[PDB]
């Protein structure tokens, strides 16, 4: 109580199970149609508005509020299990006999390879004075082993038998929400000695919550203090939700419904004001006048009578209808076994259950290349060193298949013929595998002057030295241990140095254990820098000994990066052979990009410690400083790489994620304009765009291709070269599309463009193309008339600004499928948010909207599940405003005949159960279980998707035609009961009298229920048995209710309306013909449409009655690699 400690769970979910109910209620009444019932129920209690059953007037509100609550509780259920699994799934033993779980003041023992759900303060470990190593993976892009050197003073504890003799937790101040700082200091009192001590606790002594511990054991420490002292709860976790276009254009359809609802109340007000200043009327003699007021205040009260009278025109079950349907459309996305990855055991997981119809109307898909479109397992090596290339492959040398013959296996046998001549002469001094599918590149390396023979051997060691690969104890056959890398391209270079003889056995504390050419050296790596996605660089500064004894041993600098970064970091003038190799080695990588091989480069400068010991300390002072998570590290790590001598580059392969048969063969001949956002280079993305068929033959490849790359700092004020050149051919590529920059005519023109015209903008040319105005609008008009935009979108701001340039400047749906932490800006910025689940759970999946095991499933997710859920919901919503229109205006048309005094036509249990039981379920099941064509035909004809691209189904034009059709059928469902009464008011076979207004209300309701649900049935494709049963059951509940409610005496005036109205043939006479004239003008307009101006999906369904799709198997998946032929 004094020191203010309440107990709490780890991460909140903003729906606490004790305080869930009052905050859910006030959340329900931000809906204006929902709070419109709080008006008409409190005005229901006052008797002057003439509403019978005011206590039952709450029933179509409380039922909707509870169903929106148990939907919110179910939507809390799969939400809170993320916080419940991290909260208390595990608890350590904490044995204190010698005197994942949360307890303030605990002394917890933490092993290797686990998440720490607390702020532990390190004291000691198995290493020298508490040298802790950590993989901080989900906080930042930290791929190093971040050293956490603990205290060198209190290294006396090993077991929980001496540290559990003291029970104390420390006091700290409020949170600061920053990573690199810790302003806490712990003080302790020694036993039997008067020595005070303040242990200096800095960021080097502690580590945060959401990181991963590696290689250290018995991590001992103290759990944090309660509150919000963990620095991840505010940096990440609070995410803005999104809703669809249809769920955003619904709020204009609700306003048109309320503008009509207040026109009808206004006509009810002024035409009952005109009634009460009529002179000779029956309200003087028999009816004793002045219900509330004398003249116009009597008509003002009758305004608010109509507010309560038109309580079924207000859409109360609209938003629970759109949210049950979007949830069930995503539970079928989840429950599809063809969207299921069997090899990874991973169903398609919607992280957003409310944007399924966005998957039906997308026009731009911004995939990245290597993680998503390709397997990201890299096999081949293809080394290039010192101006000559070492490797032979034919896996993707078929990329240039435009000029070569049909079957070419004679070169594939020459790989194996040179491979069996390669495992013999390399097994002279090596005890690794060196076998079939163990060694990777077939190339005779010099048949082991002659500096080249060392320079290839110097390359493979320095390649093996510049690595982020930790060895792993292989449990089966532990004599041959394997390799693990967070970067799988970086593993293939290391797995192949193990094959040429420059393997490495392990890794010590300061240095490294390495087995080079049989002998087992120990290269000592004193310093290393990290890998960021923006920098494109991984570099080591490993120390080597001097060759002659009695010297100062110099060091090396091996930077591994791309073929465009370190060529901008390379020494131009030199007295060595560092210049003449460049026109050789860049010629090889042009040959090794056009055969689709992922490229790297490795350079090396011969530094001395006279220039290095300052840059080491400049990095070491900036290693525990404030800018350890800022951009000031790269400028520290740039000065010593001003000049470099290039060793060579590597050209590993990356085979596709078998997303060839979708990427145009389903998913861009759908109509969607795809957009690769590689981060790899220009030539290797064109010749991978042909391989994944994204850009095809007969496609104009207009490439932006800035020629010179340099930074400006002074001068160049009267002229401009490096920015003026890429502006001018954006004009010159506007003869292909003969237009200009100035206007956005394309914003109101969504269309798959005639003329192919792919765009291959890259890298620095993109930065200049999105820097300022008049080049963004000029680039984006070229990007509307294209079909494919390609490459070098490195440093994910380029991927995130491009998806936001198209999303904002064109009101259009964007998708941006991806994987890895370089897409959490691309995925979150796009409209839809698909992510790819890899071998481990990555940051893109958790920040996604859907999550599929491969890119292969995007075709079925977009073309089947999305295209359905678009046309399901784009039909459902005009049907929902229809169903309230036919019913709630047929007691407006009764207002003519009671002089708008607002006497109820519908008994009020037909206004209760209309939006709940009588016609709620057909519109729900049209939204959940409607398929225009099958799931196979959705993939056989993917051009059906263009109706969402064109936005041709949901628009406010259709909504007005469904109100006006509902307003027409309201005239039919009232005046057809009216004109069987209007002549002489005797409609019974036995003359006994059904003249009561509730009995005319059954005439009006039963016409308006059956003609509503048959209107839903006539507008659904595929009359299935399940929605067909509940269209029949919703039509036969309006008879079942009056059978059992008008057989109790509790139905006061409505006492036996079953036996009197259904025993009357004039009911059934007008029921069978005022369902005709309700449905006939729409079924005429639909039949005239489906004959003379049919849409594409009637043309496809007319092919479906014929045998145009019987060839295809049920559950056809044309992007599955193992499938039969058509």
């Amino acid at each position: 109580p004094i020191m203010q400690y309440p107990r709490n769970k780890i991460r909140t979910t903003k729906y606490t199970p004790l305080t869930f109910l009052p905050k859910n209620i006030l959340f329900q009444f931000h809906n204006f149609a929902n709070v419109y019932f709080l008006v008409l129920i409190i005005l229901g209690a006052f008797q002057i508005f003439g509403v019978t059953n005011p206590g039952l007037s709450a029933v179509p509100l409380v039922v909707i509020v509870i169903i929106t609550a148990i939907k919110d509780a179910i939507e809390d259920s799969r939400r809170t299990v993320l916080d419940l699994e991290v909260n208390n799934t595990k608890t350590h033993i904490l044995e204190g006999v010698e005197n994942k779980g949360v307890k303030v003041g605990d002394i917890v023992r933490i092993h290797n390879n686990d998440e720490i759900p607390a702020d532990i303060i390190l004291l000691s470990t198995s290493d020298t004075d508490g040298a802790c190593y950590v993989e901080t993976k989900n906080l930042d892009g930290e791929t190093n082993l971040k050293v956490r050197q603990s205290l060198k003073c209190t290294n006396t504890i090993r077991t929980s038998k001496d540290i559990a003799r003291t029970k104390f937790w420390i006091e700290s101040e409020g949170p600061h929400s920053n990573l690199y700082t810790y302003q806490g200091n712990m003080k302790w009192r020694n036993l039997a000695d008067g020595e005070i001590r303040n242990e200096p606790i800095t960021i080097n002594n502690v580590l945060l919550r959401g990181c991963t511990l590696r290689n250290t054991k018995w991590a001992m420490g103290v759990v944090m203090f309660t509150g919000g002292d963990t620095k991840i709860m505010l940096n990440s976790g609070i995410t803005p939700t999104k809703k669809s276009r249809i769920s955003r254009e619904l709020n204009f359809s609700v306003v048109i419904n309320f503008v009509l609802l207040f026109i009808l109340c206004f006509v009810s007000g002024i035409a009952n004001g005109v009634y009460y200043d009529k002179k000779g009327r029956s309200r003087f003699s028999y009816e004793f006048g002045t219900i509330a007021g004398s003249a116009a205040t009597n008509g003002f009260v009758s305004f608010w009578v109509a507010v309560i009278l038109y309580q079924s025109l207000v859409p109360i079950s609209l938003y629970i209808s759109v949210e049950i349907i979007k949830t069930a459309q995503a539970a079928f996305i989840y429950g599809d076994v063809l969207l299921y990855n069997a090899k990874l055991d991973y169903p398609c997981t919607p992280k957003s259950w409310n944007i399924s119809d966005d998957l039906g109307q997308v026009e731009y898909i911004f995939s990245d290349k290597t993680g998503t479109l390709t397997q990201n397992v890299m096999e081949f090596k293809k080394c290039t060193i010192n101006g000559v290339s070492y490797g032979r492959a034919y896996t993707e040398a078929l990329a240039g298949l435009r000029k070569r013959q049909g079957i070419d296996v004679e070169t594939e046998g020459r790989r194996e013929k040179a491979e069996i001549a390669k495992d013999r002469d390399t097994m002279i001094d090596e005890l690794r595998a060196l076998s079939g599918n163990s060694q990777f590149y077939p190339e005779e390396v010099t048949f082991v002057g002659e500096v080249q023979q060392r320079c290839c051997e110097h390359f493979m060691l320095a390649l093996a030295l510049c690595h982020s690969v930790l060895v792993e104890a292989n449990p089966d056959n532990p004599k041959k241990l394997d390799l693990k890398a967070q970067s799988p391209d970086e593993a293939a270079l290391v797995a192949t140095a193990r094959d040429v003889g420059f393997s490495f056995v392990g890794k010590t504390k300061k240095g490294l254990i390495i087995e080079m050419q049989g002998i087992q050296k120990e290269f000592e790596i004193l310093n290393i820098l990290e890998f960021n996605s923006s920098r494109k660089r991984m570099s080591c500064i490993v120390k080597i000994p001097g060759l002659n004894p009695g010297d100062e041993p110099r060091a090396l600098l091996i930077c591994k990066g791309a073929d465009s970064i370190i060529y901008s970091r390379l020494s131009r003038q030199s007295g060595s052979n560092s210049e003449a190799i460049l026109e050789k080695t860049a010629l090889h990588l042009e040959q090794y990009a056009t055969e689709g091989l992922r490229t790297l480069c490795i350079a090396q400068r011969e530094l001395s410690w006279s220039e290095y010991e300052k840059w080491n300390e400049k990095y070491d002072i900036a290693a525990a400083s404030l800018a350890n998570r800022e951009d000031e590290l790269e400028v520290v790590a740039d000065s010593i790489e001003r000049e470099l001598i290039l060793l060579g580059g590597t050209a590993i392969e990356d085979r596709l994620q078998d997303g060839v048969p979708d990427c145009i063969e389903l998913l861009a001949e759908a109509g969607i304009k795809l957009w690769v956002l590689t981060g790899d280079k220009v030539e290797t993305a064109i010749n991978i765009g042909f391989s994944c068929n994204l850009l095809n033959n007969e496609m104009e490849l207009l490439v932006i291709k800035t020629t010179g790359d340099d930074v400006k700092e002074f001068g160049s004020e009267p002229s401009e070269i490096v920015d003026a050149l890429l502006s001018k051919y954006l004009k010159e590529y506007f003869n292909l599309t003969g237009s200009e920059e100035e206007i956005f005519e394309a914003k109101k023109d969504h269309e798959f463009p005639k003329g192919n015209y792919a765009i291959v903008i890259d890298g620095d040319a993109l930065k200049l193309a999105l820097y300022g105005e008049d080049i963004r609008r000029k680039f984006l008009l070229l990007c509307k008339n294209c079909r494919a935009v390609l490459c070098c979108r490195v440093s994910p701001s380029q991927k995130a600004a491009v998806v936001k340039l198209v999303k904002d400047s064109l009101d259009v749906m964007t998708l941006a499928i991806g994987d890895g932490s370089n897409d959490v800006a691309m995925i979150q910025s796009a409209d839809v948010g698909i992510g790819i689940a890899g071998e481990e759970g990555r940051q893109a999946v958790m920040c996604s909207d859907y999550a599929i095991g491969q890119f292969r499933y995007l075709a079925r997710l977009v073309l089947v599940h999305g295209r359905w859920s678009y046309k399901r919901l784009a039909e459902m919503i005009p049907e929902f405003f229809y169903k309230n229109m036919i019913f709630a205006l047929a007691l407006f048309w009764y207002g003519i005949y009671n002089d708008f005094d607002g006497s109820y036509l519908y008994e009020y249990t037909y206004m209760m159960f209309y939006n709940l039981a009588f016609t709620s379920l057909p519109v729900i099941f049209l939204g959940i279980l409607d398929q225009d064509v099958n799931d196979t035909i959705s993939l056989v004809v993917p051009q059906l998707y263009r109706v969402g691209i064109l936005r041709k189904e949901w628009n406010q034009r259709k909504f007005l035609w469904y109100m006006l059709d509902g307003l027409y059928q309201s005239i039919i469902c009232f005046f057809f009961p009216y004109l069987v009464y209007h002549k002489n008011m005797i409609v019974t076979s036995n003359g006994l009298g059904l003249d009561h207004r509730y009995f005319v209300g059954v005439y009006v309701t039963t016409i308006a229920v059956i003609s509503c649900n048959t209107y839903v049935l006539l507008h659904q494709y595929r009359w299935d048995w399940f929605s067909g049963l509940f269209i029949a059951l919703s039509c036969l509940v309006v008879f079942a209710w009056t059978g059992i409610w008008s057989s109790a005496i509790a139905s006061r005036e409505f006492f036996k309306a079953a036996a009197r109205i259904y025993g009357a043939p004039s009911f059934w006479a007008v029921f069978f013909v005022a369902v005709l004239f309700c449905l006939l003008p729409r079924f005429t307009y639909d039949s005239f449409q489906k004959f003379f101006y049919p849409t594409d999906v009637e043309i496809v369904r007319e092919m479906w009655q014929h045998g145009h799709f019987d060839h295809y198997p049920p559950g056809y998946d044309p992007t599955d690699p193992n499938r039969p032929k058509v």
Binding site: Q47, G50, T52, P54, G280, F284, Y286, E287, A331, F332, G335, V337, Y340, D345, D901, S903, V941, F976, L979, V980, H982, K983, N984, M985, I986, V987, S989, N990, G991, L992, G993, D995, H996, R997, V1000, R1022, W1023, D1024, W1025, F1026, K1056, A1059, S1066, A1069, V1073, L1076, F1077, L1080, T1084, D1086, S1087, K1090, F1091, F1092, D1096, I1099, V1100, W1104, H1108, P1114
Partner: protein, 362 residues
């Protein structure tokens, strides 16, 4: 494992019939709906044209009728006899003023003398028609007591302040007694004492009986039950105090269970035309002849310029002579044939044909 249930409902593959509206299927359907509804449009008017009705409005007996027999003017009487043999002959009407009612707004006895050429069949319904009476307003239609309808001796609190339906302007009178049929509806009861017979005149002088039993539904006696009031806490409604001049005795409380004119009036009409049964004769065919109907005028309609009438009918199973259902089923059959004639002559002699798959993206 974590693999979804392949049970053909989560797989979205249910047993659908999946209709495609080709002209070889919908043009039979328009032909079927048209040829059904012209038969139903034929069979209804074959039943509806044969319905005979007599509609005599008598609101002007106290002014436009002498003590001797004058004809009803053309506005008030409406005759329908499909055997067009005596359709132009006017009925006649006198008025016996009686000079003693002292109400002078609607008093006396309007004696209406009509002649029917065709014999109406064995169920003859005598209705009273009320035009321009406004029985459908908000405070009016909610003014009664269901517990007084169900014969419960309801107190003042359960008739005045009841939720929803309660008798608000007419709960109790000045001296503290509640009204037993409280409310504007039961107060507004159509008075006019229709006779228990149609006295045949001249040719036969044997009177055609008319019962007031069986006027409402027989099952309506389950909610209208005999009251349990002790005759000292109730009073008649303020417009019933001429038919009960001294309040209620210990013996003259109306049993509303068998008083079916009350049970028809407590069912307020939906529109501005009220037609309620008041006299039935299920037993006897009404022969062709001149009949006299003696209406004790007590219900005033002239202050709201409204009409007050008589509807003598043997309605069909559809009830009454209303040509609406026959005209609509013909219009329903003539539109479904014309829309078939449009969607076939625009389909063959011009239009399009389902011959290609090159109509979507060509």
């Amino acid at each position: 494992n974590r693999r979804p249930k392949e049970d053909a409902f989560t797989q979205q593959r249910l047993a659908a019939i999946n209709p495609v509206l080709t002209p070889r299927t919908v043009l039979p359907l328009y032909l079927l709906i048209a040829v059904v509804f012209v038969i139903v449009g034929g069979c209804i008017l074959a039943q509806n044209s044969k319905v005979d009705e007599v509609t005599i409005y008598y609101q002007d007996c106290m002014t436009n009728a002498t003590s001797s027999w004058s004809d009803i003017p053309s506005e008030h009487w409406q005759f329908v006899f499909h055997k067009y043999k005596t359709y132009n002959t006017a009925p006649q009407w006198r008025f016996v003023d009686d000079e003693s009612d002292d109400f002078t707004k609607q008093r006396g006895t309007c004696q209406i003398r009509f002649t029917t050429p065709s014999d109406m069949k064995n169920n003859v319904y005598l209705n009273y028609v009320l035009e321009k009476f406004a029985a459908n307003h908000r405070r009016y239609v909610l003014s009664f007591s269901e517990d007084q309808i169900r014969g419960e001796d309801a107190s003042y609190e359960t008739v005045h302040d009841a939720t929803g339906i309660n008798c608000k302007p007419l709960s109790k009178n000045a001296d503290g007694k509640i009204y037993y049929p409280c409310g504007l509806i039961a107060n507004s009861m159509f008075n006019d004492t229709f006779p228990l017979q149609l006295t045949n005149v001249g040719d036969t002088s044997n009177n055609y009986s008319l019962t007031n039993k069986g006027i409402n539904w027989e099952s309506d006696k389950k909610r209208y039950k005999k009251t349990k009031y002790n005759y000292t806490q109730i009073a008649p409604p303020p417009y019933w105090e001429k038919m009960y001049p001294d309040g209620y005795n210990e013996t003259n409380i109306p049993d509303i269970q068998d008083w079916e004119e009350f049970q028809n009036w407590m069912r307020p009409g939906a529109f501005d035309k009220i037609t309620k049964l008041i006299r039935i004769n299920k037993n006897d065919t009404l022969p062709a002849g001149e009949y006299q109907l003696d209406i004790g005028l007590h219900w005033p309609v002239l202050e709201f310029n409204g009409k007050k009438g008589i509807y003598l009918t043997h309605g069909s199973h559809l009830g009454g002579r209303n040509p609406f259902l026959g005209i609509v089923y013909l219009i329903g059959g003539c539109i479904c044939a014309a829309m078939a004639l449009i969607l076939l002559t625009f389909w063959l002699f011009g239009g399009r044909k389902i011959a290609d798959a090159s109509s979507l993206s060509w």
